[PDB]
Design a protein around this ligand. Sequence first.
Ligand SMILES: [Cl-]
Ligand SMILES: [Cl-]
Ligand SMILES: [Cl-]
Ligand SMILES: [Cl-]
Ligand SMILES: [Cl-]
Ligand SMILES: [Cl-]
Ligand SMILES: [Cl-]
Ligand SMILES: [Cl-]
Ligand SMILES: [Cl-]
Ligand SMILES: [Cl-]
Lengths: 81, 83, 82, 83, 82, 81
Amino acid sequence: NSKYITALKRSEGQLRGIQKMIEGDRDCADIVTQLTAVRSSVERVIEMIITENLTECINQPLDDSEAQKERLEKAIRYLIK
Amino acid sequence: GTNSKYITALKRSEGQLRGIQKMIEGDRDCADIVTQLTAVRSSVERVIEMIITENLTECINQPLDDSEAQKERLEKAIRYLIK
Amino acid sequence: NSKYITALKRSEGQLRGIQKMIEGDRDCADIVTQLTAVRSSVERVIEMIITENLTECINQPLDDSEAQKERLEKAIRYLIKR
Amino acid sequence: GTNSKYITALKRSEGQLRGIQKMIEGDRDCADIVTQLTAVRSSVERVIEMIITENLTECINQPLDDSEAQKERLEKAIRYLIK
Amino acid sequence: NSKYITALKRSEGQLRGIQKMIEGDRDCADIVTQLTAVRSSVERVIEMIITENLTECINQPLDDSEAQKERLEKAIRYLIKR
Amino acid sequence: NSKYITALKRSEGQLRGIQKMIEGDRDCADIVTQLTAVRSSVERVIEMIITENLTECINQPLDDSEAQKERLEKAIRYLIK
Ligand SMILES: [Cl-]
Ligand SMILES: [Cl-]
Ligand SMILES: [Cl-]
Ligand SMILES: [Cl-]
Ligand SMILES: [Cl-]
Ligand SMILES: [Cl-]
Ligand SMILES: [Cl-]
Ligand SMILES: [Cl-]
Ligand SMILES: [Cl-]
Ligand SMILES: [Cl-]
């Protein structure tokens, strides 16, 4: 949905800002702090997509038993990777 | 040189974020969206690790001549590695 | 669960146990090992709770499909954290 | 089919362990030795995750008809995922 | 360090704090959050100790090169754990 | 050194045993327990090699400053990967 796109757009804005921080010779801690914030915000989108995908696989199973087996397995594999 | 390498990587990553944005607007494939999101996450983490690694390295390789300054400097460098 | 409250007593007592050793200038390797054990015992309570909550969520779903979806999402989100 | 897939992977891994053994006896390259050790570790972890994933999947997809049995079964399946 | 002993008091008190809530059949989401905070506060003491020990190991090496090697190895091994 | 080879040989023995466990239709928990033990023993060799390598880079630096910089960085990168 459209909540991810806002969050991705922000991360993208922060990434170009961090570019300006390196190209202006800012220090290790200021740069790492911002990069970590970008990293967590991307990870949070990843987690939300994985969570929603696994929820829908559990909550709305396919008719075919083997198909539903393979679909849950793929959803869970993302959870533990 | 070091710093240009970082900026190339970060510009790749922000480019991939825009691509991923277009995917989600299209209700495009969910397994693909996670794969490329993970690729962005990994490349950002790569830059983080390189910066922390270089910082710690030059703490060890180029110690400060004030001993208390050097203790505090190394502690911060190691804590960045820990976190 | 008095399951958890006995485990939280062990850990809490282990913490003041550790605290004597730091007061003691005592063996640094021991102190870390003992702190790590406290950390793990707390974590296993955390994992037991979130496991139970997701189990109840899967086995006893809400009546309303949308409510159950939001409920599953939150239960799953507690898994992918540490 | 499932089980043959696992055995192929595990036999690859034990083969790579013997290769790594020969490397260390030769005082061979340390960066290579870690890379391939990590590859073995990853492939073993892949088998672990597949087994835990399938176990959890068939807990959900094929629930037990005793309700208390099914609660205990699912709890163990999720705890394997957690650990 | 009385640095650590104040932190270990907060955590230990937070644990019996949590324990009231489990006795309370209290909000499950809160309980996990509060346990996670205890887990993190213990971990940060762990990381502070191992960071200090490796710092002292790098800055104040032993006289004997082999002894220093074994000493560095053990200090580094405490990093790569969780 | 030769302590790694003993440990690797054991892991290799356990891996073929786990093969016999699957090919004899043993259950999820027994198989996972053994595979986890193999995984930790491999990881422990990895950690020991990384630890020793980083120790020697710190304890026995190269003469050249840039060379020593790149060598420590590679050693530390393995530590945090
Ligand atoms: Cl994260
Ligand atoms: Cl943010
Ligand atoms: Cl690289
Ligand atoms: Cl991380
Ligand atoms: Cl101490
Ligand atoms: Cl696969
Ligand atoms: Cl793991
Ligand atoms: Cl509870
Ligand atoms: Cl491990
Ligand atoms: Cl073993």
